[PDB]
Amino acid sequence: LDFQSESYKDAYSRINAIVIEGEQEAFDNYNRLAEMLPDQRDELHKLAKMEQRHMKGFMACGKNLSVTPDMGFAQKFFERLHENFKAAAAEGKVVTCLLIQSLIIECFAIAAYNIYIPVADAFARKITEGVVRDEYLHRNFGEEWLKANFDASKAELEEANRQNLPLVWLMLNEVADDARELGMERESLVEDFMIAYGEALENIGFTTREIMRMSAYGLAAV
Ligand SMILES: CCCCCCCCCCCCCCCCCC(=O)O
Ligand SMILES: [Fe+3]
Ligand SMILES: [Fe+3]
């Protein structure tokens, strides 16, 4: 792709902002989770530190392409999901917080970042390669915890999914056209996110009917 074209740079201004904002919010989210889960405080602080590194990497990706990120756009993009995390944290709802960041958001990021890698400029490709591998660890942390605590967490997981999965589906739709400009096909993003999230839900303990119901709250939101 022509990384120096005005159409590419325009789309990149919003995409770069979105990823910078997402990493920043993930840093705050894992730091908040560290307070909520004393037994895993050290591990969660380590995950937060990785997010800070990711944020700085993506800031450099924008600099490399001479793109100024549209942070106002990115704030608004995350706002509804972010405020839901904040409310859950205030309520001491650790399960909801874990689902939002560790599973929903990390799965969205894994799906999107892996689709970006083969169309990314060489500088951004190497950065993204390093970021996605941390994302596997983040998702794995959430899966391990929720699986180990499945019975106690299940009802809240269902409630949290119903409220928050539609928000990420709306985000997926909002980003689709800019992502297409960057060479990332919407069909791939949708499939890969649905597969990743569905598999995560199966891995933690949900049945086929439960996975379909949970996934449908997202798909039906469009
Ligand atoms: C600037 C280069 C990265 C471009 C990748 C394409 C991204 C397009 C989809 C937008 C969704 C990004 C979600 C980011 C959330 C990050 C959360 C986390 O790090 O745990
Ligand atoms: Fe990250
Ligand atoms: Fe992460």
Numbering used by the authors: 10 to 231
Show the paper's wording.
Cyanobacterial aldehyde-deformylating oxygenase (cADO), which catalyzes the conversion of Cn fatty aldehyde to its corresponding Cn-1 alk(a/e)ne, is a key enzyme in that pathway. Cyanobacterial aldehyde-deformylating oxygenase (cADO) belongs to the superfamily of ferritin-like di-iron proteins and contains a di-iron center. To gain insights into the reaction catalyzed by cADO, we determined structures of wild type ADO from Synechococcus elongates PCC7942 (Se) with different treatment (WT0, no treatment; WT1, co-crystallized with iron; WT-HP, soaked in H2O2), and solved the structures of two SeADO mutants (Y122F and F86YF87Y). SeADO belongs to the di-iron protein family, with conserved sequence of two EX28-29EX2H motifs, in which six conservative amino acids from four helices (Glu32 from helix H1, Glu115 from helix H4, Glu60 & His63 from helix H2, and Glu144 & His147 from helix H5) act as metal ligands.
To explore the effects of H2O2 on ADO activity, a crystal of wild type SeADO was soaked in H2O2, and its structure (WT-HP) was solved. No electron density was visible for the H2O2, probably due to its unstable nature. In our WT-HP structure, a long-chain fatty acid molecule with a bifurcated head-group configuration fits the electron density well. In the WT-HP structure, the helix conformation of H5 was restored, and the two coordinating residues His63 and His147 approach the active site and ligate the Fe1 and Fe2 atoms, respectively. The water molecule that bridges the two iron atoms in the F86YF87Y structure moves towards Fe1 and is not coordinated with Fe2 in the WT-HP structure. The two iron ions are bridged by one carboxylate ligand E60, the Lox ligand and an oxo group. Both iron atoms show saturated coordination with an octahedral geometry. The higher coordination numbers of di-iron center, together with the fact that the crystal was obtained after being treated with strong oxidizer H2O2, lead to the speculation that the WT-HP structure represents an oxidized form of ADO. Furthermore, the coordination mode of two iron atoms in WT-HP structure shows a similar pattern to that observed for the R2 protein of ribonucleotide reductase (RNR-R2), in which the oxo bridge and the coordinated water exist at the di-iron site in the oxidized structure, while both are absent in the reduced structure. We proposed that the Lox ligand is likely to be the analog of the possible intermediate product hemiacetal, thus the WT-HP structure may represent the intermediate state in reaction of cADO, following the entering of dioxygen and its reaction with the substrate.
